[PDB]
Design a protein around this ligand. Structure first.
Ligand code: MG
Ligand code: MG
Ligand code: MG
Ligand code: MG
Ligand code: MG
Ligand code: MG
Ligand code: MG
Ligand code: MG
Ligand code: MG
Ligand code: MG
Ligand code: MG
Ligand code: MG
Ligand code: MG
Ligand code: MG
Ligand code: MG
Ligand code: MG
Ligand code: MG
Ligand code: MG
Ligand code: MG
Ligand code: MG
Ligand code: MG
Ligand code: MG
Ligand code: MG
Ligand code: MG
Ligand code: MG
Ligand code: MG
Ligand code: MG
Ligand code: MG
Ligand code: MG
Ligand code: MG
Ligand code: MG
Ligand code: MG
Ligand code: MG
Ligand code: MG
Ligand code: MG
Ligand code: MG
Ligand code: MG
Ligand code: MG
Ligand code: MG
Ligand code: MG
Ligand code: MG
Ligand code: MG
Ligand code: MG
Ligand code: MG
Ligand code: MG
Ligand code: MG
Ligand code: MG
Ligand code: MG
Ligand code: MG
Ligand code: MG
Ligand code: MG
Ligand code: MG
Ligand code: MG
Ligand code: MG
Ligand code: MG
Ligand code: MG
Ligand code: MG
Ligand code: MG
Ligand code: MG
Ligand code: MG
Ligand code: MG
Ligand code: MG
Ligand code: MG
Ligand code: MG
Ligand code: MG
Ligand code: MG
Ligand code: MG
Ligand code: MG
Ligand code: MG
Ligand code: MG
Ligand code: MG
Ligand code: MG
Ligand code: MG
Ligand code: MG
Ligand code: MG
Ligand code: MG
Ligand code: MG
Ligand code: MG
Ligand code: MG
Ligand code: MG
Ligand code: MG
Ligand code: MG
Ligand code: MG
Ligand code: MG
Ligand code: MG
Ligand code: MG
Ligand code: MG
Ligand code: MG
Ligand code: MG
Ligand code: MG
Ligand code: MG
Ligand code: MG
Ligand code: MG
Ligand code: MG
Ligand code: MG
Ligand code: MG
Ligand code: MG
Ligand code: MG
Ligand code: MG
Ligand code: MG
Ligand code: MG
Ligand code: MG
Ligand code: MG
Ligand code: MG
Ligand code: MG
Ligand code: MG
Ligand code: MG
Ligand code: MG
Ligand code: MG
Ligand code: MG
Ligand code: MG
Ligand code: MG
Ligand code: MG
Ligand code: MG
Ligand code: MG
Ligand code: MG
Ligand code: MG
Ligand code: MG
Ligand code: MG
Ligand code: MG
Lengths: 131, 134
RNA sequence: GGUGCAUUAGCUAGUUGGUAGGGUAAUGGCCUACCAAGGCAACGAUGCAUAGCCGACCUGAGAGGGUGAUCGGCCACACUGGGACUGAGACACGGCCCAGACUCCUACGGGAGGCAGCAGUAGGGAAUCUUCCGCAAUGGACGAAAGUCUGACGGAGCAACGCCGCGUGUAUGAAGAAGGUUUUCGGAUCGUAAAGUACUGUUGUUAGAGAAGAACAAGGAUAAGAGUAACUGCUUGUCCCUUGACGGUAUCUAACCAGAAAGCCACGGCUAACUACGUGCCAGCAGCCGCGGUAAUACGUAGGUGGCAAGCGUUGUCCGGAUUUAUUGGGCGUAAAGCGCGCGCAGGCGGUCUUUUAAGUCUGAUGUGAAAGCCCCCGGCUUAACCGGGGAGGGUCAUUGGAAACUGGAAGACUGGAGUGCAGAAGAGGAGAGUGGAAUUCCACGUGUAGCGGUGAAAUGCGUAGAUAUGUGGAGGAACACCAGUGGCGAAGGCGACUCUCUGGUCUGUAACUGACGCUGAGGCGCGAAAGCGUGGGGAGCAAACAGGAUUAGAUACCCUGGUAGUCCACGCCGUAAACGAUGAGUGCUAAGUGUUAGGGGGUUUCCGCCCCUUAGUGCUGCAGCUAACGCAUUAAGCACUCCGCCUGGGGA
RNA sequence: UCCCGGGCCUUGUACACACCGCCCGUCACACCACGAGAGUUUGUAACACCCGAAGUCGGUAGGGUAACCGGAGCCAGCCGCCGAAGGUGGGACAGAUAAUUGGGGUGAAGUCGUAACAAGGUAGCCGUAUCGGAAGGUGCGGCUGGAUCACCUCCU
RNA sequence: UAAGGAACUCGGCAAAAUGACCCCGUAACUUCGGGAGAAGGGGUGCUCUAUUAGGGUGCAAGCCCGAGAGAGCCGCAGUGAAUAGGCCCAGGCGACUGUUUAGCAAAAACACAGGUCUCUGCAAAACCGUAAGGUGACGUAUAGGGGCUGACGCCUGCCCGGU
């Protein structure tokens, strides 16, 4: 059965990148909103829209490629799996690809990236690595 | 395996095996029981001196000894160098080292430490074979 | 919070709790009488084995792995067992009593002992030091104080055992001394190293000067205080005097001497460094690959070279390389590795939204994590080692204050998961009872004459007691011709003649209903081809064992003629297979092309038929992706998450 | 069509010194480790009874006795519980040893056959039953990890 | 009957030893019932607390039954007499309980439950009798007669020339 809806978000984007698909849509959730919204802030995804329906709504994401078809996202990874959750202190927040990537952290002040977390001295659950 | 599987029974590593069992064993005469202490050399009195032939394709005649160690274990040693002076009922010092050609020989007799004397007319590599400066 | 074994499953009876009392510095089954039958354990009790614990040490990029000697903290022990006295403190290392083993003295009645204190002796061992000098400094016990005691402690002695420092000489000097070693005999190398000239004394030898470690205490004068009727006396301050085992030690300056001071291992590759002679699978070498059989860069010796140097090699033990137990950081189609399959307790994991809580999570303050050690910054020893001062780090730690995104708890809400309802469909799914037709065998009777059967060839065998063939009838048992199809059904094994009875599951359509009711699942419980086992039947064909005939050098085989258990049925066991897709179960995503099974929708058409779309199965071909390759590829061996099983060189096995 | 030598293509291979290849098992000899064995012998931790020193505690005390008011109290002696060592008994566990025996491993040259690798000369393998000097043969069910020999079906 | 304790003897033959009740504890092996009273140990008398605590009987009077304890007392000895299992280790034979030579042999012999072969379709075969008449049987192949083997477990091989 479905045991990790966040992992599906991470892997659906990865599966669409390989075949250069220009868009995708998937069932919506509150936590997926920030993750999808965060990616738009650093240009990892070209756009995002919400569709309201009966069950839970629907979200579609517009993937982004450079001129002459280079991927903008070269990898997505899930860290804190349901089988082994991980937590990071204020000084333990990593730097994905030596600052050229980002990490999504679910702090007590909201879901925000690794760079912003070290500016507020808070920790939380590390959710994903995007580079 | 999965983390839960890896918690119910953790990972057990392999155990190495020593190649010189007799060197790392002791004896207590009061209790007649072997004690477990490591040791770089052991001494004993040899009970038989002779030769056998190595495995194929070598064809020489290798000079060995049969020593009874101080802790009461009967082992087979090997005399290096050209010519020796060993006889039955002689006290010698053995040390670790296996010879490949010989099937059962697992130890080396050190030369120049006890009743066994150094090699005659050795000019170089003299620290081995126990020959003093000429 | 820190160890191995499940090839160690139960353990316990003052044990578990209660009531009254005793005892202790103090609570308490600590002890006693009564009452009840409890307590612990698969989150590993009990038992066996091993072990003092920690700060720390070695290694490692780190996470970890191994260790617990020296220095510091705690514990236990004092020849082996037991007991108590004295005391603030002991069940007491150089105290007592009893028992035991051992040594010694006895006048035979009896007595005396305990180095795991500092030295030292014997023994064991591959292996570890002097039967030294002082209380001068520090700290102890007693004393009012000098002072006494202190094998604590300061020093000295032995051992290259380790770390650190630098001495065995510097500069100039030949196309190049002699002599080794090689040479296609000209030369090359040792070698600027010799020899020569000039210079230095760290070290050496001799002789002269000679520290710090010393603060003291006590004793003598004073001064000021508290207390005094007054002193003596007490507290603080300043002057005078006094004490060194090391030891004439460290350290300076005076002179003479290149003179007394370099070894160890390797040179085929890994791995820096190659030529001669001797030997001839011999002697021998070796960590692995492997070298040696009359031209060995690998054996032995020389010359030369290369690594280090007061050293250098070998052995033993630990970590690394080893991702070779993989949390960081591996895997299971064919290399080791998916249980034969299901039903499921415990456990692990879990769709969407709102409010609240604050266990997990993040953050601030306080207390603490000793000293020494690693690390950072300064300073002293002529430098270093070494020694001081300050700091840092080190915790799933305790008290307390915050945050609410995520996991958890509580209260509600929803329908994409799951299940029920309603309308259809297909199927060798299972158990029981009965029936059918071909064909083989046997039996009875007509017809009929000499062979039949069998093989690569034959023979055994059957037949004139009349076979084989043929026509008619009877008895009995087992399997179900065509249909039949990478077709169907089932969890797997497996299920194929027909009818009826009793039963399980699945697919499609609808959106009425409940509202997360789910997935996996160690132990447990069931099913499970064939052969095999027990009891009672049945027995037509087939056929292990067995018999005969051939083949063959032999033929305990293949081939031929016969043939018993078995194969069949009822009940009860057994529990295995190349039980295989050599591929665990659940879920989602990711080009297409084309057959086929069971359904649904739409367009053409009167139907039929053709086409398109869609759900669940079943085959083939192929992109991205994966793979060591073969190959897999929407029925993944691709991309991901959850749970279970299993693997860590071969043989032994 | 066969026998010999050779040339191309394809198929299978456990062969590469290349089929004059490779390789399995019994038997004879020698050595090594392990299990069983009528027995023998060392050791560990307990348990149940018998006996029970020292000692603390409890009871008496007829013998001895300065402090306190002959009295009290105290002490010796005796008695009771608990109790180390010792003795007896049946079990548990661990090691060593033993006539003989069972499979296993090593040894280039010994004897017997040739089971597997090619269609290995009867395709091989898996479970099971029986038989045979030995590799192994045969029956029943299963697999392809089979080149094979014929009509049909799907893909290119 | 001192000391010894099988040295006697074909052989521990005979004798000696254990012996009741209550409590603790108990091995190999096993057909799971056993072995087992395994083995090996401990306690018993009298007085007081005491017509006990508590039970049976009765309407009550009363009568009967009698565990645990404590304190004591006496003997060399407390089921103080008589009566009352000795036990263990290993092997052969027979599975077991049973039967046998009145008057020499009680056993390893016979029997047995079980196995197998064979005969018998009923006026059955088999047996007694010259026959009638009977047993078998007021039975009917899951029944009846005869031969051999003898619980149970694993098995039962080759030969049909001779009789
Ligand atoms: Mg050498
Ligand atoms: Mg603990
Ligand atoms: Mg109390
Ligand atoms: Mg207690
Ligand atoms: Mg324990
Ligand atoms: Mg590493
Ligand atoms: Mg560490
Ligand atoms: Mg020491
Ligand atoms: Mg001692
Ligand atoms: Mg006291
Ligand atoms: Mg003591
Ligand atoms: Mg003392
Ligand atoms: Mg003590
Ligand atoms: Mg002391
Ligand atoms: Mg002493
Ligand atoms: Mg004594
Ligand atoms: Mg000493
Ligand atoms: Mg000594
Ligand atoms: Mg010695
Ligand atoms: Mg002093
Ligand atoms: Mg002092
Ligand atoms: Mg004083
Ligand atoms: Mg003294
Ligand atoms: Mg002294
Ligand atoms: Mg000292
Ligand atoms: Mg030194
Ligand atoms: Mg040395
Ligand atoms: Mg010369
Ligand atoms: Mg020359
Ligand atoms: Mg000098
Ligand atoms: Mg001088
Ligand atoms: Mg001087
Ligand atoms: Mg002083
Ligand atoms: Mg003074
Ligand atoms: Mg004064
Ligand atoms: Mg004054
Ligand atoms: Mg003063
Ligand atoms: Mg002087
Ligand atoms: Mg000077
Ligand atoms: Mg000079
Ligand atoms: Mg090199
Ligand atoms: Mg040569
Ligand atoms: Mg070499
Ligand atoms: Mg050489
Ligand atoms: Mg040389
Ligand atoms: Mg050199
Ligand atoms: Mg040095
Ligand atoms: Mg060294
Ligand atoms: Mg080493
Ligand atoms: Mg590792
Ligand atoms: Mg691997
Ligand atoms: Mg898998
Ligand atoms: Mg294989
Ligand atoms: Mg495999
Ligand atoms: Mg499977
Ligand atoms: Mg559950
Ligand atoms: Mg959730
Ligand atoms: Mg939960
Ligand atoms: Mg510290
Ligand atoms: Mg400095
Ligand atoms: Mg320091
Ligand atoms: Mg410091
Ligand atoms: Mg919230
Ligand atoms: Mg709140
Ligand atoms: Mg539904
Ligand atoms: Mg059916
Ligand atoms: Mg059926
Ligand atoms: Mg018919
Ligand atoms: Mg012929
Ligand atoms: Mg006929
Ligand atoms: Mg199915
Ligand atoms: Mg049904
Ligand atoms: Mg049905
Ligand atoms: Mg179906
Ligand atoms: Mg509703
Ligand atoms: Mg399930
Ligand atoms: Mg199970
Ligand atoms: Mg069967
Ligand atoms: Mg049967
Ligand atoms: Mg039968
Ligand atoms: Mg034959
Ligand atoms: Mg036949
Ligand atoms: Mg059956
Ligand atoms: Mg098996
Ligand atoms: Mg299996
Ligand atoms: Mg199958
Ligand atoms: Mg398998
Ligand atoms: Mg899967
Ligand atoms: Mg799937
Ligand atoms: Mg399909
Ligand atoms: Mg191995
Ligand atoms: Mg192994
Ligand atoms: Mg040609
Ligand atoms: Mg090869
Ligand atoms: Mg063959
Ligand atoms: Mg046969
Ligand atoms: Mg077959
Ligand atoms: Mg094949
Ligand atoms: Mg007598
Ligand atoms: Mg007597
Ligand atoms: Mg006696
Ligand atoms: Mg006797
Ligand atoms: Mg006699
Ligand atoms: Mg006799
Ligand atoms: Mg008698
Ligand atoms: Mg009463
Ligand atoms: Mg009596
Ligand atoms: Mg009696
Ligand atoms: Mg009998
Ligand atoms: Mg008689
Ligand atoms: Mg009659
Ligand atoms: Mg008659
Ligand atoms: Mg009659
Ligand atoms: Mg019958
Ligand atoms: Mg029988
Ligand atoms: Mg008989
Ligand atoms: Mg039987
Ligand atoms: Mg017979
Ligand atoms: Mg006959
Ligand atoms: Mg005949």
């Amino acid at each position: 059965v479905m045991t990790d809806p966040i992992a599906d978000f991470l892997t659906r984007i990865r599966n669409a990148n390989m075949v250069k698909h220009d868009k995708l849509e998937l069932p919506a959730s509150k936590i997926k909103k920030e993750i999808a919204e965060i990616l738009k802030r650093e240009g990892f995804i070209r756009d995002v829209e919400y569709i309201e329906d009966d069950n839970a709504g629907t979200i579609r994401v517009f993937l982004k490629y450079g001129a002459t078809g280079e991927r903008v996202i070269t990898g997505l990874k899930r860290i804190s799996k349901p089988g082994l959750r991980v937590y990071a202190k204020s000084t333990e927040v990593p730097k994905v690809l030596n600052g050229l990537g980002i990490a999504i952290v679910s702090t007590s002040q909201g879901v925000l990236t690794d760079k912003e977390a070290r500016a507020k001295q808070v920790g939380g659950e590390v959710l994903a690595y995007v580079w | 395996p999965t983390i839960n599987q890896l918690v119910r029974k953790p990972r057990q590593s392999k155990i190495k095996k020593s190649t010189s069992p007799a060197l790392n064993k002791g004896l207590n005469s009061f209790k007649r029981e072997l004690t477990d202490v490591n040791s770089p050399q052991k001494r004993g009195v040899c009970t038989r001196v002779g030769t056998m032939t190595p495995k194929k394709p070598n064809s020489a005649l290798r000079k060995y000894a049969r020593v009874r160690l101080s802790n009461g274990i009967e082992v087979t040693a090997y005399i290096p160098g050209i010519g020796h002076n060993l006889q039955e009922h002689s006290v010698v010092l053995i040390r670790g080292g296996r010879v490949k050609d010989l099937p059962g020989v697992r130890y080396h007799i050190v030369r120049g430490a006890l009743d066994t004397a150094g090699v005659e007319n050795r000019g170089q590599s003299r620290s081995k074979y126990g020959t003093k400066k000429p």
